[PDB]
Amino acid sequence: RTEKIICRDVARGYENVPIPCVNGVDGEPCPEDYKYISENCETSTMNIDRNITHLQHCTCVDDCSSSNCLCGQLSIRCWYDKDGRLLQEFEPPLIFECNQACSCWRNCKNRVVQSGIKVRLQLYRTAKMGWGVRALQTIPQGTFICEYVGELISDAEADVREDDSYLFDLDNKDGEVYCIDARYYGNISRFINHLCDPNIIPVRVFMLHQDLRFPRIAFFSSRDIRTGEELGFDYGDRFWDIKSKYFTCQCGSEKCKHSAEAIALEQSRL
Amino acid sequence: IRTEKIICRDVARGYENVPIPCVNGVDGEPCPEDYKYISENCETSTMNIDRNITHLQHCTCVDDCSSSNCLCGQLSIRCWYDKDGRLLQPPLIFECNQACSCWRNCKNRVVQSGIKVRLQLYRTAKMGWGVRALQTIPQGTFICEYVGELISDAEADVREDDSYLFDLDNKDGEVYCIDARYYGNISRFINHLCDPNIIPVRVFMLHQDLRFPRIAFFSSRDIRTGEELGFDYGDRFWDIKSKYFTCQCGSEKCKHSAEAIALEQSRL
Numbered sequence: 055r056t057e058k059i060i061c062r063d064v065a066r067g068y069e070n071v072p073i074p075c076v077n078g079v080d081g082e083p084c085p086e087d088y089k090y091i092s093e094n095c096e097t098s099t100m101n102i103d104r105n106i107t108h109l110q111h112c113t114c115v116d117d118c119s120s121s122n123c124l125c126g127q128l129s130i131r132c133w134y135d136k137d138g139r140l141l142q143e144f145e146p147p148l149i150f151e152c153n154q155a156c157s158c159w160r161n162c163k164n165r166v167v168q169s170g171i172k173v174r175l176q177l178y179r180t181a182k183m184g185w186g187v188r189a190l191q192t193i194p195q196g197t198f199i200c201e202y203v204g205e206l207i208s209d210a211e212a213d214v215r216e217d218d219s220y221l222f223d224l225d226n227k228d229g230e231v232y233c234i235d236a237r238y239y240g241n242i243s244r245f246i247n248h249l250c251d252p253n254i255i256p257v258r259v260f261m262l263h264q265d266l267r268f269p270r271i272a273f274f275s276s277r278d279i280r281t282g283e284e285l286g287f288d289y290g291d292r293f294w295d296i297k298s299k300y301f302t303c304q305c306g307s308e309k310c311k312h313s314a315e316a317i318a319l320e321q322s323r324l
Numbered sequence: 325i326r327t328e329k330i331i332c333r334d335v336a337r338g339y340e341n342v343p344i345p346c347v348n349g350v351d352g353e354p355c356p357e358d359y360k361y362i363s364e365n366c367e368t369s370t371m372n373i374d375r376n377i378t379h380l381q382h383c384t385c386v387d388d389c390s391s392s393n394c395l396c397g398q399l400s401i402r403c404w405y406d407k408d409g410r411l412l413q414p415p416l417i418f419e420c421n422q423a424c425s426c427w428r429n430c431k432n433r434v435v436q437s438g439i440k441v442r443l444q445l446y447r448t449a450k451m452g453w454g455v456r457a458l459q460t461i462p463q464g465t466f467i468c469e470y471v472g473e474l475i476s477d478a479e480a481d482v483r484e485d486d487s488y489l490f491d492l493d494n495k496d497g498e499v500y501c502i503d504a505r506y507y508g509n510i511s512r513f514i515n516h517l518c519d520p521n522i523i524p525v526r527v528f529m530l531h532q533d534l535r536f537p538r539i540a541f542f543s544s545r546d547i548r549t550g551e552e553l554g555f556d557y558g559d560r561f562w563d564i565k566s567k568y569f570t571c572q573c574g575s576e577k578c579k580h581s582a583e584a585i586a587l588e589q590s591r592l
């Protein structure tokens with residue numbers, strides 16, 4: 055079966071680079087049961103706090119490469135290197151990028167996520183997991199890949215929705231909990247599958263607002279990724295504790311934690 | 325002779341598509357820094373702008389939105405863009421948005437795609453800072469947006485300095501202003517001309533909250549390199565300001581000079 059290219063760009067030119075779709079596995083048409091959006095949306099009143107006078111910001115007159123940068127200091131247990139790659143210490147990390155209140159320029163060293171997708175990605179048909187996303191180039195460890203984009207909703211709203219297959223929990227620790235639901239509105243991330251041996255990780259980020267209800271979710275590679283490799287993150291135990299009643303993990307890794315067999319082994323262990 | 329100094333390579337600090345340099349060949353005034361340059365409108369208290377994506381009117385085009393079937397074009401009042409992104413023509417523009425089925429590069433995206441022409445902030449002889457063209461700008465070309473702090477009418481009324489205040493002129497409902505005094509972009513430096521070469525146009529892009537049109541300047545004629553950009557601030561501005569200073573635009577048909585004022589008072 056020939057690998058058919060069935061959409062030149064599922065993002066319709068909204069990203070820095072196109073994200074084509076191919077299918078060399080079956081007859082499934084390009085997915086159209088969602089609306090592609092490149093930035094988060096709301097379908098009820100969220101009213102993100104964007105008061106420019108309440109943004110924490112820096113006064114740097116350089117490129118914000120120094121440890122004196124306030125925005126760098128606000129970042130929790132992570133920092134960027136000269137090439138825009140993310141380094142960690144590992145309480146989950148938290149990135150404060152520079153913003154419109156900072157004295158610095160738009161091209162300072164603390165602007166990776168807000169500058170958008172730089173790597174070549176592809177939406178493709180997997181053998182066993184439906185649609186997936188893979189790299190069309192080599193990607194070094196620590197590289198920004200893409201943002202988890204979708205519809206901002208309350209945890210209360212998320213609990214009553216019928217389909218939770220595209221639901222991301224922001225897990226706010228101070229204040230009410232919100233989610234990003236990519237079921238009806240989402241970007242390329244909605245198609246990223248779960249891997250027990252993941253090669254990307256989600257990281258909370260603040261950029262042009264610092265409304266603590268709504269960290270934005272950035273994926274960075276957690277290791278060097280090879281051309282053609284499927285992208286995947288660890289959805290987490292909570293997802294599988296719920297979903298395993300319907301289906302189990304097919305990531306196929308020797309380290310798979312969520313297969314029928316793995317779950318049975320964890321049960322007998324407990 | 326005093327010669328011209330380049331005193332800032334880019335007053336926008338890289339936030340626009342192109343740099344906007346500042347020069348001074350007139351006096352010793354330094355680069356203006358009594359404001360914060362912002363490339364898009366800000367809030368300092370919330371305006372509760374309706375950003376609900378399901379409230380957007382949007383089109384179903386999969387071409388370049390050049391056809392008469394584009395709902396967004398059908399929404400747009402007494403104006404439309406040509407294939408070069410130039411405005412033909414009080415107009416009200418609805419650009420395509422994130423709910424439309426079209427691509428980000430369709431023909432109805434001119435203002436949201438930002439500054440394309442080369443502008444310079446420069447020191448004028450008599451009118452403080454001004455903005456001039458560094459290139460030929462054909463009639464109908466998008467120049468820049470009037471950017472600043474969104475505030476209520478009531479807030480506008482208590483503010484000391486109204487020299488950078490733009491009235492959105494909502495005919496119905498709640499009244500708002502853009503104050504570029506504390507936060508603004510290159511538009512805050514555009515002077516008044518009695519023979520203007522740009523016009524402000526109301527535009528909707530990523531939201532359609534009708535209380536908050538965004539203000540886009542388009543050239544109203546072919547503009548040549550070196551020409552100072554200016555719009556007609558309007559009579560309301562001058563009815564207030566003329567007591568403090570008169571118009572220095574130098575037009576043969578200046579409406580607000582000391583000379584023009586002397587005639588008006590004489591007639592009455």
Ligand SMILES: CCCC[C@H](NC(=O)c1[nH]c2c(c1C)C(=O)CC(C)(C)C2)C(=O)NCc1ccccc1
Nearest residue numbers: 146218219220221222223225256289290292293296
């Ligand atoms: C399809 C989406 C992936 C599954 C998903 N995972 C996450 O939401 C999630 N949230 C966080 C992480 C992760 C993986 C982190 O690593 C750290 C954090 C601070 C960024 C917070 C999930 O649990 N959704 C809620 C849910 C959906 C369906 C059934 C049950 C529960």
Ligand SMILES: CCCC[C@H](NC(=O)c1[nH]c2c(c1C)C(=O)CC(C)(C)C2)C(=O)NCc1ccccc1
Nearest residue numbers: 486487488489490491493524556557558560561564
């Ligand atoms: C520095 C700003 C220029 C002066 C200014 N002009 C305008 O606000 C204005 N508003 C509109 C237009 C104009 C010129 C239009 O053409 C049509 C429109 C639909 C775009 C509405 C103004 O009146 N500000 C309020 C004000 C300030 C100081 C004293 C008195 C009043």
Ligand SMILES: Nc1ncnc2c1ncn2[C@@H]1O[C@H](C[C@@H](N)CC[C@H](N)C(=O)O)[C@@H](O)[C@H]1O
Nearest residue numbers: 183184185219220244245246247248303304305
């Ligand atoms: N490791 C996995 N094993 C089995 N199914 C998976 C796995 N990861 C993702 N899925 C499937 O994909 C859904 C999650 C989606 N966000 C991913 C995109 C999805 N594959 C699609 O075609 O739309 C899950 O609810 C499963 O149906």
Ligand SMILES: Nc1ncnc2c1ncn2[C@@H]1O[C@H](C[C@@H](N)CC[C@H](N)C(=O)O)[C@@H](O)[C@H]1O
Nearest residue numbers: 451452453487512513514515516570571572573
């Ligand atoms: N035609 C004009 N004649 C005299 N002064 C003007 C004229 N146009 C603008 N100004 C001056 O500029 C102010 C409006 C500003 N938005 C323009 C930028 C201003 N020239 C500056 O240096 O900051 C007015 O309040 C006047 O002080």
Ligand SMILES: [Zn+2]
Nearest residue numbers: 112114118123
């Ligand atoms: Zn800094």
Ligand SMILES: [Zn+2]
Nearest residue numbers: 118152158162
């Ligand atoms: Zn910075």
Ligand SMILES: [Zn+2]
Nearest residue numbers: 112125152156
């Ligand atoms: Zn900063």
Ligand SMILES: [Zn+2]
Nearest residue numbers: 250303305310
């Ligand atoms: Zn697995």
Ligand SMILES: [Zn+2]
Nearest residue numbers: 383385389394
């Ligand atoms: Zn259209």
Ligand SMILES: [Zn+2]
Nearest residue numbers: 383396420424
């Ligand atoms: Zn449209």
Ligand SMILES: [Zn+2]
Nearest residue numbers: 389420426430
């Ligand atoms: Zn369009």
Ligand SMILES: [Zn+2]
Nearest residue numbers: 518571573578
């Ligand atoms: Zn005049």
